[PDB]
Every structure is written in structure tokens, then in C-alpha cells.
Write a protein that binds this ligand. Sequence first.
Ligand SMILES: CCc1ccccc1-c1ccc(CNCCc2nc3cc(C)ccc3[nH]2)cc1Cl
Length: 327
Amino acid sequence: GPVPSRARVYTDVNTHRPSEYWDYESHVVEWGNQDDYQLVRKLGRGKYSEVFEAINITNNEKVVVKILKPVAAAKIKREIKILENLRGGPNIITLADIVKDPVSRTPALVFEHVNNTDFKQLYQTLTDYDIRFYMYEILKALDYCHSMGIMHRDVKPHNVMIDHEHRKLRLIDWGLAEFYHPGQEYNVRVASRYFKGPELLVDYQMYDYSLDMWSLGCMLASMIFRKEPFFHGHDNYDQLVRIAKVLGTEDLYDYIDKYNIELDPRFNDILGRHSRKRWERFVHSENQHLVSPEALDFLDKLLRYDHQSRLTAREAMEHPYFYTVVK
Ligand SMILES: CCc1ccccc1-c1ccc(CNCCc2nc3cc(C)ccc3[nH]2)cc1Cl
């Protein structure tokens, strides 16, 4: 069978905190007044929720209301427990209230409002300095939630709100987040395709916080190399082939052999043989201003098949790539 794995950091957090901390099923939800919030406009719909711009009439403040679809309503206690546990943490979205939506009859989470700068404007105009700045702000959020025994499991640009005018960042959508328990086998059907770690793609369930570090590396590669997403798989299988065309097949086989993982035989006719590519291939006159030896070294230390070998969030914070960032 597969070789067990455990995180190299924060393994003991959930065993040394009381059962009340991680046992989200036992937690009792206190409901607020749904008529305190007037819905203004729908911002989006996903498979687990609908998100609205709203106004809190008890203070006159803009808020975001997320109304959970009945499918996600089953695992609301987990999201609420994670949001309450992390509330006040650096760059974590603040849960302001929880109400019962009168239409869906499902829980509706009320969050602080972030005046989000359009994704395209950010993706097209952030400087080398700003990219480093915002990556460092994401690292604060990830080190915080990992230090609190939580993995996000859905790190991606869509889940990072940036108010560029106020240089304010928030990591949102904690709906796929989970408490990390060493030895626990987790669902690999997490994160979005382009950001899924090789551990998920090869069906290795004993993963940990380091999955978030791979997703972060995917975001960095996309930004500095101007390819969004960086690893653009047609499906979960082709997603691993796309990675292997850059990082090579040899380190992939060393990875699966280390953990005694048996690859799905469907990979035999699609994976091929690929050498690891040097990053200069992805550097052109247009994006050279975003690329530096420090950016490449930092990326090399995130985008590793072996989840145990990746930089942790705290280690990533002292990488030379952030020396130019005002602290
Ligand atoms: C290429 C990704 C990346 C790499 C390195 C540094 C930063 C970023 C980044 C990170 C986040 C964003 C902005 N993302 C907006 C996502 C978003 N999701 C929302 C959801 C709601 C309900 C409202 C506004 C929302 N805005 C833009 C960018 Cl460019």
C-alpha cells in the first residue's frame, strides 16, 4: 500500500488544542437577523453557493452575503468553524454574521466588504514589486491558517481579493478548507483543476498544508510568465501531463516511487518521457521585467512534485524574492 506521510510543520496543532476547536460537527450555530441585510446584486454562482453584494442596514455598511446551496449546506459547520477559528488572522476574510436565508432556507454567511480591483487590471498592471508584495501578503494568510491547523485547499486567484488602492488582500472561500490531522486520508477532489497539486492528481490522500504551497506556485508562475493558468490541463489526467512537460517525468516517477503510489494505468499512453525544462523558455522581452533569479529560485522551491520538499509558508517568507518588499 501507499507509504504514510505527515506534514513537516504544525502536525500537532489539532491534538494540543481542545476537541471544541476542530470538532466542527459538535459546534452550535447562533443565527442573526436576515432582515438586517438588504441584497443589492448577485456577484456570482458556484456549485456550492451564490454570492451577493448587500448592505447592512443596522450600521450602513456594505457587506458580502454568501448563500449556501443545499449540497454545501451539509458541510456549513466546517466552513463556519474554520472562519470563526481564523477570524482576525492576517489577511483572512472576516465573517461578520450568519443568517438563515428566507428563500433557500440554507445558511447565508455575511462577510466584510473588500472593494476588489478588477482581476484583469491586476493581472495586466501589477509590477514586479507588487507581485512580490501581494505574494508576501498571501504567505501571511497561509502561514496563519496552517499554524492554526487548517489547510485552505482552494488557493487560486479567484479566492484572493485585492483592493489595490488600499494595498489590502484577503484570502476568501474557506468552503473547501479542512482541519489537518496527521495520518488522515482526505478527499483528492479539492482545489480547482489548474491549481491541483500532483498529490491530488496521482490520488495520494494523505496530503497536508503543502498542497496550498503548490497552488501558490501555480499562481506565481502564471503571473511572471504571462500564461493564465500556467498548467492548463483539459481534464485531471492531462493536468498531470501538462505539469510533467515542464517539471519532467523522472522526478514524477521518483515521487510516486517514494510514497509507493501506483499511477493510474491510463497515464501510460499519455505521460510520455519529458525532461525537466529550464525556466528561460518561458521568458520573453514582454515578461522579462517580472522574472529574476530570485523569482525562479522561489518558484523552483514551491513547484516540487514531492509535497514534503516544498517550502513551507514561513520558510517562503524569508526567501530572497521578498527582500525588496517593505516590511
Ligand atoms: C495571477 C494571480 C496572482 C499571482 C501573483 C500575485 C497576485 C495574483 C492575483 C491574485 C488575486 C487577484 C484578484 N482576484 C479576484 C478574485 C475575486 N473573487 C471574488 C469574489 C467576489 C464575491 C467578489 C470579488 C472577487 N474577486 C489578481 C491577481 Cl493578479
